Amino acid sequence: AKKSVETYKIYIFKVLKQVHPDIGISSKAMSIMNSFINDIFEKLAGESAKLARYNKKPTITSREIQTSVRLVLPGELAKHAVSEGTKAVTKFTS
Amino acid sequence: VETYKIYIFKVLKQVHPDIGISSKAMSIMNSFINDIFEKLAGESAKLARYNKKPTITSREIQTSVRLVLPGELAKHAVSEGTKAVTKFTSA
Amino acid sequence: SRSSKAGLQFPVGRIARFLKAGKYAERVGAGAPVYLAAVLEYLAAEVLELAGNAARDNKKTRIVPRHIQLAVRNDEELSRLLGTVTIASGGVMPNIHNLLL
Amino acid sequence: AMSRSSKAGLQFPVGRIARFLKAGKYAERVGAGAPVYLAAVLEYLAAEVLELAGNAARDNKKTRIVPRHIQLAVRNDEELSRLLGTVTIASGGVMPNIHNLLL
Amino acid sequence: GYIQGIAKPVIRRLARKGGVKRISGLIYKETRGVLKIFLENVIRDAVTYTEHARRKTVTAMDVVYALKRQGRTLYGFG
Amino acid sequence: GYIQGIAKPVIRRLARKGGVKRISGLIYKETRGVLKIFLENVIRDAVTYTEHARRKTVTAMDVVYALKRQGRTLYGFGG
Amino acid sequence: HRFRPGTVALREIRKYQKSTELLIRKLPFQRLVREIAQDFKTDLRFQSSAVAALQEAAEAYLVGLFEDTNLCAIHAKRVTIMPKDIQLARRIRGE
Amino acid sequence: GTVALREIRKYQKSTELLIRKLPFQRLVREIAQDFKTDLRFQSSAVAALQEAAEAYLVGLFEDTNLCAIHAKRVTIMPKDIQLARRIRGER
DNA sequence: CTGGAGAATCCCGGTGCCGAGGCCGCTCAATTGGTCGTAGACAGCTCTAGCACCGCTTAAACGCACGTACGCGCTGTCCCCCGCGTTTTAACCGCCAAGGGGATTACTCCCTAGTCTCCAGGCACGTGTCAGATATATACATCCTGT
DNA sequence: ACAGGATGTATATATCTGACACGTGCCTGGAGACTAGGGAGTAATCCCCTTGGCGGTTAAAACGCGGGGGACAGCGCGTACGTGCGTTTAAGCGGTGCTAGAGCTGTCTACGACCAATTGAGCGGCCTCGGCACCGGGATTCTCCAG
């Protein structure tokens, strides 16, 4: 057996089949999308950590993630991402 | 509010005995020290994270210095760090 | 599962574990991983939808790095987000200056 | 009770730097050698910048370091300029640079 | 708008500080446009930082952090 | 050194990729100089990363991190 | 009358490269900053140090932009900078 | 000057690498020989280096072409590359 | 400018490859249920510092005259790179073989987290003044116009 | 190219001045000693993959010979931008006045770290076959040049 590297390939494939019913995706494109997701996640987590450090709060809540999303993603992407996150949290807490 | 003003003043009196430093220059030096320390600490955190080790030793700081400071600054800083750690361990 | 509750397709639990293990903060809220997963899902859906449109414009049914490069560069806000990013084996945008012709 | 700064021979706060490393959560554990090394590096950089600024001040026959002198010290030395290429210094002005063809 | 308050001689002095020797008549509009874009970006980031901290007073540290985001670090303001 | 091994038609094809209609005869030297400088920077960072881990084999992750340092993030090679 | 070939331009270049104080008028710049911040969040109050920091950043950015524009304009064998010079300097920088 | 435009279209339409693999590998190994002797490169590492170098060179040539067109010329020249590097802040 | 005409281009159809998509173990991580400690939500207080107005000075913006320098178009010339045919070089594919080094496992143990004690270095705050600016009083280097 | 004059630029003095160096008080985090527990270090072992080699093609770089277009220097004219100079006009200074929210403290609860038990979601491997890279072959479009 060999040690495994945890990646988002399954979830990216699920999303692709959700938006485009028939279009597949090659290995290189999947790797590019996985690296893109990892980089965006790292940027958002880093900005949330800096925002928590600046105000001395040790906790990362949905509010820090929302502020980090507004900081990093520009314009309409930020607005849509904030709306999606708010909808997800609202559905989750119920 | 904790800043490096006293230590910066001590270093300045160590290098240039007869020259003082104004408040604006002291604030600039304090911000520069904070920024360099933040850069080095962040690079050492990334180095520890990539190799999965949870400990920051002198080796991580040395590699971070070599990655951040350029050229002769990196070489002299590495020499100074090794000298200080060597003196500290034996005393 | 939390992903089933929030309706997301992304691994909320895995993102929470990444936030905890990465030592980004000493504590993590219960709502933060859900929000982060929703944002990641939205971004991935946007880029994959654009890439799929580009692929269908090229009479193909398999996304390739060229299609993702075209989708990223043609879209404005994504290009602004990925300005410095280099996509391996992605080629360049077709661009010939007016004076050259 | 000799402080760790005295043991290392430095002048910078080794203990304070260790506290900053631990509190910032840069890593789960911080070695005992890291704060001394970091204090030495910071002290060397501060000494270099202050020495260059003091030389600039003595060039202008001023005995007090001001932001203009720090700006001159940073932008003259090549390596420090490379390290601080994008850094803006308040009230520091700019370097004198007039192109040949404009004369 | 209030952007017109930036008079011509101010831009002339700024350019002379940058080494320029002659300035065309159409530069002035473009300089105001670029200045407005830069200020808009920095102030938007500062306002996001402030709204995060539940304050209505944009402080110097918020502007310093907003500049540090753009890779244009400012020294001498904490 | 071996930097001269980069053939001139390769530089011509690279320039044509960027949308250039004519190339002066002296471009083929400045391009080699700039390429060598960039490679030297990236390889220096990658070699430092590798020496930190004690390995003697420079992996793809080291080069990707080195590029990410210079603000030239690379997708499609992991990380 | 007197010397008018452009000598005063060089004299101003020397004088303003030697100086360090702020150049942009403080009150109009404060009005501009408040107007820009009006859109993003209504009824904002600025600390004076924040306005000063914004002014310093704007001055540094404009000085850098004009240095690059001067390089571009001299590159084209001209002396007088033109809007296309600024547009090129911004396009190359990749802001 | 038509074949130039034909090549521009053909090469902007393509995705594969243009730098010869073996000479570039020799160059990379020779450069790394100075920093650390007796190194062994993974094939994927050399591929990543080659892709980064190609992307950087293509970007530099795009900016150089912009500078050359700005001066009402078509033949890019070394001064164009030097200016494009100076403005970018890389030099 | 206007039609051959040749080279590059795309459209269509057949071939064969091999990488994408699915299914089978099974493992370790996601989840549930408590338990406990505390960071944070919320209310309340104090007063620092930001906003607004008013009157006076005058530094600096603004409008205008003007003339000179510099931008831009046009011309002529030569040189240097593009196109292309040919020869020579070595990149590259395909296979083989070695062994150096990366990836785990196991044990030991040395070092660092956590805790209690103690107190002195570090920060806030009164204090004096000496290194900073400032305007008048000459001395000196530099550009303009004419010779 | 030289010289006289007008003009910025610099040197030297008293004259004031508040930012900085200095001294005093209080406190919390740094240093030390103790404990334990697990990450680091070292050694061993396996085998995976990277370097080196060989050999034959054969893609393709190197070289070279036209020649054409375009880089560049030169020429001129046109106009607009820099430099005064008189005339506003708000910036800047201070002083007052009000109060919004910065900043802090104090409770007390809802929320997250943390322990274990449980089990299935995801990951590796192992497959199969259809989308696509490729290759002719023919129809279509573009560049070029004699007419």
Numbering used by the authors:
A (entry chain C): 59 to 152
B (entry chain D): 63 to 153
C (entry chain B): 18 to 118
D (entry chain A): 16 to 118
E (entry chain H): 25 to 102
F (entry chain G): 25 to 103
G (entry chain E): 40 to 134
H (entry chain F): 45 to 135
What's the publication's text?
Excluding archaea and few instances of eubacteria 2–4, roughly 147 bp DNA is wrapped around an octamer of two units of histones H2A, H2B, H3 and H4, forming nucleosomes in eukaryotes 5. One exception is the gene locus LOC_Os05g38760 (MSU gene model). This gene locus encoded a previously uncharacterized histone H4-like protein that we named as H4.V. Sequence alignment indicated that H4.V resembled H4 in length (103 amino acids) with similar histone fold domains albeit with minor modifications. The histone octamers were insoluble when folded in vitro with H4.V but were soluble when the N-terminal end (53 amino acids, accounting for most of the variation) of H4.V was fused with C-terminal 50 residues of H4 (named H4.VS throughout). In order to investigate the differences brought about by the residue variations to the nucleosomes, we performed single particle cryo-EM analysis of nucleosomes reconstituted using recombinant histones with either canonical H4 or H4.VS.
